[PDB]
Amino acid sequence: AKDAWEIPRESLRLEVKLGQGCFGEVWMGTWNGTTRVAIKTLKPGTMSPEAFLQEAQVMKKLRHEKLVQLYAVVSEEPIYIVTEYMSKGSLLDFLKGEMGKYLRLPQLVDMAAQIASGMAYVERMNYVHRDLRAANILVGENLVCKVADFGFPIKWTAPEAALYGRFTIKSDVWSFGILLTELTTKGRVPYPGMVNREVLDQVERGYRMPCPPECPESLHDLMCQCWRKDPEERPTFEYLQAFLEDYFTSTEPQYQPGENL
Numbered sequence: 001a002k003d004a005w006e007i008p009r010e011s012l013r014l015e016v017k018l019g020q021g022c023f024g025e026v027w028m029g030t031w032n033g034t035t036r037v038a039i040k041t042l043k044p045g046t047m048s049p050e051a052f053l054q055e056a057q058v059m060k061k062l063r064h065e066k067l068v069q070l071y072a073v074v075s076e077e078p079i080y081i082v083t084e085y086m087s088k089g090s091l092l093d094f095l096k097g098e099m100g101k102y103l104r105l106p107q108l109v110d111m112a113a114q115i116a117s118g119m120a121y122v123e124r125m126n127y128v129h130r131d132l133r134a135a136n137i138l139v140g141e142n143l144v145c146k147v148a149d150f151g152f153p154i155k156w157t158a159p160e161a162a163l164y165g166r167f168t169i170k171s172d173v174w175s176f177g178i179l180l181t182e183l184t185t186k187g188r189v190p191y192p193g194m195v196n197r198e199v200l201d202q203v204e205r206g207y208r209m210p211c212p213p214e215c216p217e218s219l220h221d222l223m224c225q226c227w228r229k230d231p232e233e234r235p236t237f238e239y240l241q242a243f244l245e246d247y248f249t250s251t252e253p254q255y256q257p258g259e260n261l
């Protein structure tokens with residue numbers, strides 16, 4: 001028995017390959033011959049309707065302009081998931097690429113605000129992303145950013161989650177903190193020079209990334225709030241959204257552009 005999200009297979013045209021991997025593939029395509037869409041194919045060898053359908057409900061229930069929207073599914077294998085198309089790809093490729101040159105703090109804080117808005121919706125609904133970071137954010141026209149791909153990357157993960165599996169909205173706040181350094185360095189790996197083992201030992205004994213060049217210290221404080229040892233002292237996304245939305249009036253009103261930020 002199938003639900004309202006199902007579509008017939010004839011309605012999809014896959015046109016350009018965009019991404020690859022062990023999971024499957026991602027294509028840009030057309031739905032019902034008239035609707036630009038992203039399509040994610042899954043190889044028949046990989047995870048079955050036992051763990052597909054449990055993980056489908058998440059993307060079927062949650063709905064917000066700052067989370068990448070499900071449009072349709074072909075559920076019987078081979079599986080196809082159809083979502084909205086984000087014309088600029090992942091945030092990480094965006095910042096690294098041709099556009100990074102031109103982005104400055106106002107745009108970068110704005111993108112942060114938007115993700116914070118998406119995650120504040122996840123927070124209200126009592127969910128947890130678990131792998132929040134630039135690679136899992138998509139960008140569209142007019143710098144619209146949307147959270148994607150809800151769950152090894154210990155550099156983005158809060159210590160309590162990486163050591164004890166305590167994944168909570170507060171461990172997503174930590175990852176947001178790291179995301180802010182990706183935004184403010186145009187997409188560089190965090191903890192540059194440090195292998196994964198080095199990062200746990202250091203973070204656990206108090207080490208935190210310093211202020212990136214040309215980034216205001218007030219913004220690096222926000223980062224340090226997200227990186228508090230004690231999960232419950234980290235701010236909410238409601239707070240973070242508000243802080244970033246209001247940033248240039250309330251916090252940094254004499255901001256003057258520089259060479260990179």
Ligand SMILES: CC(C)n1nc(-c2ccc3cc(OCc4cccc(Cl)c4)ccc3c2)c2c(N)ncnc21
Binds near residue numbers: 026089138
């Ligand atoms: C960066 C590029 C390859 N890409 N990836 C995507 C993309 C990223 C993650 C996705 C995750 C998806 O969900 C995975 C999944 C897995 C099991 C069950 C369900 Cl319901 C859903 C579906 C489509 C996706 C599509 C994308 C997009 N929507 N628009 C434009 N470009 C996109």
